[PDB]
Every structure is written in C-alpha cells, then in structure tokens.
Amino acid sequence: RYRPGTVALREIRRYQKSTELLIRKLPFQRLVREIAQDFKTDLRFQSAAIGALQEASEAYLVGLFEDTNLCAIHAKRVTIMPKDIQLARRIRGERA
Amino acid sequence: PGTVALREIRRYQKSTELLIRKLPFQRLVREIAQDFKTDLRFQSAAIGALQEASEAYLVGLFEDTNLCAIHAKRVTIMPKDIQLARRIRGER
Amino acid sequence: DNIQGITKPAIRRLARRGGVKRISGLIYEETRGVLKVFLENVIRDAVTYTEHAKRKTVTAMDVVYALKRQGRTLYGFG
Amino acid sequence: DNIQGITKPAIRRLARRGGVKRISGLIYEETRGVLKVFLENVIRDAVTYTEHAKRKTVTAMDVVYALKRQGRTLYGFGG
Amino acid sequence: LCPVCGDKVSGYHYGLLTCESCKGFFKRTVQNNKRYTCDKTQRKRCPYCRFQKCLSVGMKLEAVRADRMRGGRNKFGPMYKRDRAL
Amino acid sequence: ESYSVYVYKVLKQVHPDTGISSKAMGIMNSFVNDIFERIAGEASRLAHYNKRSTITSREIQTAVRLLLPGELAKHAVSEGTKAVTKYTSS
Amino acid sequence: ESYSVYVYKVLKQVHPDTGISSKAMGIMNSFVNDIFERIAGEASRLAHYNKRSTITSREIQTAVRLLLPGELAKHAVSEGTKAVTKYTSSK
Amino acid sequence: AKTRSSRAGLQFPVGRVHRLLRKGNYSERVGAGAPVYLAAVLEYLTAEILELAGNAARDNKKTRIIPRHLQLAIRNDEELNKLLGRVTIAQGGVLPNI
Amino acid sequence: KAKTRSSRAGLQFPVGRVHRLLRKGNYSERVGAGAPVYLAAVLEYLTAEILELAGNAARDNKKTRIIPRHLQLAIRNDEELNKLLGRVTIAQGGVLPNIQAVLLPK
DNA sequence: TGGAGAATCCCGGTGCCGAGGCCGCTCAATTGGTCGTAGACAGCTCTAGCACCGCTTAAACGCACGTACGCGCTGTCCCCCGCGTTTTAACCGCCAAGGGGATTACTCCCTAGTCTCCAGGCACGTTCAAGGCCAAT
DNA sequence: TATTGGCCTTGAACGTGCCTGGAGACTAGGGAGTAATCCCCTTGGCGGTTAAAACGCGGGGGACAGCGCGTACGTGCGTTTAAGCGGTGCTAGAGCTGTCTACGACCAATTGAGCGGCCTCGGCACCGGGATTCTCCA
Ligand SMILES: [Zn+2]
Secondary structure (H helix, E strand, O other): OOOOOHHHHHHHHHHOOOOOOOOOHHHHHHHHHHHHHOOOOOOEEOHHHHHHHHHHHHHHHHHHHHHHHHHHHHOOOOEEOHHHHHHHHHHHOOOO | OOHHHHHHHHHHHHOOOOOOOHHHHHHHHHHHHHHHOOOOEEOHHHHHHHHHHHHHHHHHHHHHHHHHHHHOOOOEEOHHHHHHHHHHHOOO | OHHHHOOHHHHHHHHHHOOOOEEOOOHHHHHHHHHHHHHHHHHHHHHHHHHHOOOOEEOHHHHHHHHHHOOOEEEOOO | OOHHHOOHHHHHHHHHHOOOOEEOOOHHHHHHHHHHHHHHHHHHHHHHHHHOOOOOEEOHHHHHHHHHHOOOEEEOOOO | OOOOOOOOOOEEEOOEEEOHHHHHHHHHHHHHOOOOOOOOHHHHOOHHHHHHHHHHOOOOOOOOOOOOOOOOOOOOHHHHHHHHHO | OOOHHHHHHHHHHHOOOOEEOHHHHHHHHHHHHHHHHHHHHHHHHHHHHOOOOEEOHHHHHHHHHHHOOHHHHHHHHHHHHHHHHHHHHO | OOOHHHHHHHHHHHOOOOEEOHHHHHHHHHHHHHHHHHHHHHHHHHHHHOOOOEEOHHHHHHHHHHHOOHHHHHHHHHHHHHHHHHHHHOO | OOOHHHHHOOOOOHHHHHHHHHOOOOOOEEOOOHHHHHHHHHHHHHHHHHHHHHHHHHHOOOOEEOHHHHHHHHHOOHHHHHHOOOEEEOOOOOOOOO | OOOOHHHHHOOOOOHHHHHHHHHHOOOOOEEOOOHHHHHHHHHHHHHHHHHHHHHHHHHHOOOOEEOHHHHHHHHHOOHHHHHHOOOEEEOOOOOOOOOOOOOOOO
8 A cells, every 4th residue: 555645746747747638528528518508509619619728728727726736835734725726816816 | 012003004005105215216216227228317207107116016016925924824924925926926 | 517527536637737736625616616717708708709700610719819818828729 | 235225114114005914024125126126127128118219318108118018007107 | 345254355265255364264163173162353252153154144164175185176166257257 | 189178078977076186187098098009909900800901890899898897898888889870870 | 821831941950850740830830920920019019109100120129129038139139130231231 | 060979979089089090000991980989988988987986086075086086996896997907006005905 | 033032131931921911910001121031030030949949858858750748848948938938828738847845755 | 674566667569640752833922113202311499307505304223122923842633545346428430411611703882082171179378266374462 | 372364375277379180072992791602510329348437435644723932023212314395507318390312112024932732651659578666664
C-alpha cells in the first residue's frame, strides 16, 4: 500500500506531461447543447466549435485551479476548499 | 489600540482628497522621467493625472492585500499578502 | 441533468493538471457552477455572433471571436 | 533619492483608505518599489508618445493615452 | 427698507430684498443650528424676535446650502432674475 | 468640440433643479467619448467579419447587445429601435 | 489566404533540417494575424492622434516601440530600419 | 424639422455623430440609421448615469453633482459597475465600506 | 524586368500582400511606400525568433517536427515572449511542469 | 541499510497516415505616365514652464511605553485517500437522409460627391447671490 | 464676550460676435437583396467491447481549536523640517499661417507567384521486454 499523497504526486507529474482533453466528449456536447437551448431553439454545431469550447474551458479551469492552489498554500493548508476558489475569483475580478 | 485606526479608516474613506504631498511626487516623477530623455518638460495636468492614477492603483492594491490578509486569519497586512495579490492579479 | 456528466474524476484530473495535491469534498459543486457560468457567457456571445450573420449553424469563428471578446484569445482554430 | 519623499504617514493614509486596520513595518519599502514600477511603465509610454510630433513638453493627453493603453482608463483630464 | 428690521436693504438675500445684517444673522443661525431663549435699535435686543420676523416675512430657509457650495446660482435664480426685471 | 450642451440638456430633463460642476462635466465628456469609441469599434469589427462595406443599424444593435449587460442592453436596444423607427417615419 | 509558404521559408532559413505539423502552422497563422492586427491598430491610433491621413514607417516604428518589450522592440526597430534603407537604396 | 435630432426625437447631435463615424476609419460607407441608433444609446446611458448621480446627491442635502456623486452612483449599481469596472474617476474616492 | 518588392527589401514575407491588407483594413486614408516594408520586416523577425525557440524545444525531445506543445514550451520559457503572449491560450499546448515546494514529501 | 514489488525507462519492429514535393492556370502583384494635395519647411507671436525668495504653520520625525497580536505547540476527531468488485454508458464503425451553407446572374435602391446658404456651437466678458473673514463690541 | 455688521472672494448661469460645419438637392454607380441549384455536412439509429464511472470501507494524516508567551506595533508629546502660498523675472518652445514640391492615389497592360489536386514515403506512434529505479517498512 502506498502512503496517502504518493499517488497524488504521481498523477500530478503524469497529467502535466500530456496535452489531451480530460473531459469525456459526449457529456460535454450534451451540456453545451442544453446550455445553448436557452438562447435559440434548434441550433446546429460544427465539430470545430465544440472542440474550441472544450479547449477553452479546460484551459480556464486549469488556470483557476492553479490560482486556488496558491490561495490554499497562503493559508497554511494543503487541501483546497471552496473559500480558496472564491478568493481567487474575487481577486481576479470575475466575481462581483 | 483599535479606536484611532477605525476613526482614521472612516475619515479617509469619507475624505476623497489626495493623500500625497505634491512637491516630492513632482521630484520623483521628474527623476524617473530623466532616465528616458534629457531636458524634458512637463505640464501641470500631466503630473496631476500621474498622481491620481498612482493613488487609485495603490488604494486598490491595498484593498486586495487586506482581503488576502483576512483570508489567512490575520488583521495585519504583510509583504507576502501584497505579493500574492499581485501574483493572482497577473502583474509581473 | 447533463451537468452530472462532469464527474468527480474529471474535475480531479483537471485539478491534478493544475498542481493541486489534496481536494476537499465540496469542490466539485463549485467547479460545476463556475464552469456553467463561463460556458453560459461564451455561448451567449457565440450565439449572438451566429444570429447576426443570418445562420442556423454555430461555426468555430463565432467561438473564436467570442473568446477574443473576453480577453481569452485562442490559437489553432483559425 | 527622491523616493523617500513618499513618507510613511502617506503610505499609512493610503492603507487606511483601503480599509487596513494593522500595518506591518516592512510594508513601506514594498509599497515604494511597487509605486516606482508603476510610474516607470506609465512614464515610458508617455515619453514615447511625446517623442512623436517632435514635442519637448509632456502633455496630459500623453499620460492619458499611456494609461488607456494599459487598461487603466482615467476620466477627468481631457479626451 | 429691510422688512425684517427696517434698515437700508443691500440686495437679494435668501428670497428678497434684505440688508447685510439680516443676511448675516440668518446664515449664522442656519449654519450653526442655533437655539436661544426669548426696529433697528431693538434689532440686537433678542435673536428670537428678529428670527421669527425673518421667517414670517417669507424669506426662505432652503436657500442656505447644507454643504455650503461656493459660487454659481441656486434654483431661485430664474425667479430672482424675473423679479429683478422689474 | 465637447458634449457639454447635450449633457446639460439631459440633466435638465432628468433633474430640473440640480446643477453640475466643471470636473463632473469633464468626466461625463470622457465617458461619452469612451462609450462612442467602444461601440464604433465593435460595429466596425462586426462589419469586417461578414465581408460588408457598410455600417448600418443592425451592426450597432449587435454591438450594443455584445457590450452592455442584460437590462442595460434591453433598454438601450428598445430606445435605439424607437429612435430609428421615428426617424424613418419622418 | 495564409502565411504557410513564408513561415516555411523562414523555418528553412533558421532551422534547415526541421519540419512542422499542420496544427503548428494553424497556430503560427493565428500568431501572425494577431501581431499584424495589433501593430496596425496601434499605428492607426497614432496617426489619428496627430491629425495625419497617412501611415508611414514612423508610425510603424512608434507602434513597435509601444507594443513590444525592450530587447524585442530594439531588434525589431533595427531590422525594420535596415529593410527600409535597403528598399529605398534601390529603385 | 431641419435637424436630424428633431426628426429622431433626441437631444444628441446626429450630424456630429455621423461626421465622426465617417472621419474615423471605421468603414467605407455609413448607413442612414446608424447615427440615430448610436446617439439614442449614448443619450440613454448618460440619462441613466445622471439620474443615479442626482439621486445620490439628493440623499444628502446637496444641490450640485461633483465627481464623488458620480463615483457613488456608478459603484452602487450592479449594471454600471460591470460596465465601468476598469475606469478611474478624478476625485471620486472609494465606497465607504469595510 | 519586373521585381518583387520583397526582393528589393531583401525579405521573405510578402510586401504586396501586406500593403493590400493595410489598404483594405480601414487603417488610414493613405499608406506610405515604406510602411509595408517595415511591417513585413518586423513580422519576419518575430516569426524567426519563435521558430528558433520552438525548433530548439523540439530538438530537446528528440523530434524533427514542431507540434503545438513545442510552441507552448518555447513561448512560456522565454520572459519577453511570455509577456507579449500573456493572455493567449494555445490549443493542445498544455502547461509547464511546476509543483510547489511545500507539497513535496519531507 | 536491505528486500519485495509496482511504476518507469531504454530498446528494436512495424506499418500507416500525413508532411512534402510537383503541375496547370488564374488572379493578384508590377510598370509606367499623369495629377492633385498631404506634408515638409521656414518664420513669427505669445503662452507658459522653470527659477528664486520670504514667511508661516501644519505635517514629519524622534522617543518612551505597554498591551494586543502573531506564531509555535498539543490533542483529537472528521473525512478524504488507496484499493478491489459491480455497473454503465462512452467509442467506434456503418449508413442514410435530408438541411443548410456556398456560388452565381441580376436588378434596383442606397449612399458618396459637389455646391450654396446660414444658424448652431465655441470663445469670451460680465453678473451676482451666497459663503467667508475681519474689527468693534 | 461670544454676537453684529461690512467688505471681499466665487463658481455656475447669462449676453455677444462671428465662423465653420450641418442641412437641402441632384446625380451616378455599385453594394446589398433575392432566387435557383449543388452538394458537402450535420443529425440520427443500432449493436458489441470494455474502459471508465460508481461503490464499500478501513485508517492515517491533516484541519481545527485551545493556550502560552514574547515583541512588534500603536499612541502621545516636544521639536524640527520643509511643504504650501504669494510675488517677480525671463525666455524655451508650443501653436498657427504660407509656399510649393515631393509623394501617393488611379488606370491599363502584362506577367509570374501562389492556391488546389494528387501520389508517396518517412517520421512517429504502438508493443513486448528485460533493465533499472522510486516507495515502503521493519
Ligand atoms: Zn434687515
């Protein structure tokens, strides 16, 4: 058995060496279509549009997680909590 | 040791006037500008605008620093809070 | 609904790429909310761009222009 | 050495306007450095604008354009 | 003459013709929010009589500025000018 | 060339018994110029995207929808449409 | 229209034995278009500020100085001035 | 009605906006309805900001709008705060919070 | 007899194409004879620098073709290029390997 | 420090799909002459930026002091991590039917361009009522 | 003596002159608006793996609270320091006008550089496979 935290570091090293998308494609397409439903009914999407949206979303989430990690480390912790996300989004200027 | 600080905060948040002496700021502005070009000349309005922009920027930075300090279970701001605020802000 | 398609392991992977070591139990709902807000904004701009052009199909150019409008310029899709 | 003209009471006033209750003793040097970095980046673009049009006097609109270039739009100084 | 006391008027002060004395008295009273306890010769006898007569003749209170902004003209400017046309 | 006359008329329409200072007037002028520049640039980009050589009311409406937030965008679109309809009626 | 031919020529100039992929060319085309738009917009703004109806090498030089970092701006200004002088020398 | 603003029922100059659109290098041609729409939008935004500033100045017993009132009006409104979030106002101060 | 403007200027990027883009882009009423030369030279210089850094990054990983990850590595490892391309995301680029020191085992 | 034992790297084989090198033609880059004005250049008027100087007084600086706050330590209990079974729906391949994007003749209304008339908008100089300051009281 | 008065400073509202830019009218040419056609291209089914999501559950390390202690930061007062407000003197350089030429727009032939389509073969990804090195504990 590996002590808690070794597999986390292994995953961190592994997922920072790759460039593939980390979200399953079909649920993301369904979510995108459901969100777009409220703007105009019976919309069609090119595959490139959904791919670009997915790429942008993953990049944004990775950056937000980096900021959240910095905020959590500031408060003498190792575990990220929602309050760190709120602080990062507040300082960034996203949340009012 | 908390009453005078609160009174100062109230008065300076209601105050809306400038908070830096003008002659030292003018001297600093001219000293910085002398590096890029020689025998430069300035208008009064340019120096006023520079001062006001600097003051607004510093006030905003201090607000963010206070937020970062409060996040860490403290009431005293430290250089680490300023550095974290500028890092997340994206300034380099 | 479809938001549950963004599962716990997916958010875990996204956090792992971000360097996060330990994750709490209430992180995933916050991540879902912020992702919904971001997608809503981008899709709104893209749909407006599509509507102005007298079209019923969303192209990659609309997404790229919408991302550029938010200061999130994206390369590789035209 | 004119940076010391930004005295400690002035920095304290600026912090009080920001809602700060307690201030450490190492804040002042950091604030001075930050102010110098900001002013350098504004003044460089202001002088660059001034060199265009063959002028020897820096105008307010030069600093206004320099600020607007950095996403720090300022109202009340023309333009 | 100034209707509040009976001296020579100096001009348009908080509604109509008054003198410098009554203008000053009104501005001090309004700015200081002064409260006391109760003819030109008797104009200094009691603040109450002069004050109540000033409010009675119709000269107005809101003409005084709470923030004491300087210069310009107040809302009664068009009215003052129309009355001054005569 | 400034917007002082028009801003003053708007203020007289809104608050008939409230004045304005010189510095506030300068701030209002800067605000109007900034908003004009933003909307015009967005309209120009929209016209360039669709390979069009003209800027019409459609591009202005789309730019207003893209820039202003929800209720502001709704009311601005309503006011602009009313103005264009009245002008076209003549 | 694209910049693939010119990008490939520049790549062969700097790295003789080195290829590229299609996605990398797409990214480079986006990069070139972005930089072109930035410089052109800055030059147009500079021309409009000074009340002039022409964009010359001077506006390009000032825009490059405004938009690029120090060493990059210096080298770009040197290269552009050299190119303009070489172009003017011939006729 | 001779002025285009009279036809459009506006208090902003349609002709000046048209001239600025033409001599600004936005497009080769400008439609006849674009200046009207733009002037109406600008007038509405100015009226909104002025109304909020006047209300802020009338809360306190004041009778003249200074930049502090404009800053208070913009900061306390959710829509205008988002619209003008990256704008510095001369002699506006900060919101009396914290 | 006809000579290309790029050959006169000694460039690889096109001068006529840049001139046409400047004319059609609604930037100025007139365009000077030397502006496209300067713009093309600057663009060529920037492209050459990025290509050099990306090629070195690709050679580091024992590859002979440049892929988006090499471009991202070259851009993010250079301070001036990173400052220039600060708000730009590269498709299929990834992130730089970076772990905070505290998170490491004691 | 030594021992299992998972995670990881250094090695060929292989074959497949995309990078990269031709052809033909069309369409955009080049040449050359003519012409109208944008901008270089020189000269003159007058704002305004920069120097000193004296006096008054509010900010800046120094110093003694004591209490509130930061930071280290200890204990305990919640709750996330690592791993081994079940359950599920994401991928992949194929296919077929429209739906909508892209291209092309074509025609007609919309907007640029020029010339003339004259009032809206900017620059001033001048109120002028209201807040401010002073001595005699 | 803390209250009367008299003179002085003040910042948006008003008049006046004049000029440059908006309004009206007319015409020519091209940009935008509709149809008709073509064919990619997007949506929708069906069935067989099988990798990924879901689930159970024991425990170990980390979040969190309590307490003690030392010094750094706040507060007050006497004493320097120099910022702030005038007045005066003296140009450097901004700001506008005039002349006239050098440069860039525009048009018509003319030619060659650069997109599209089509083989093809070499870099790169995938599998064993033993070799070697990270973890963990006892
Ligand atoms: Zn009287």
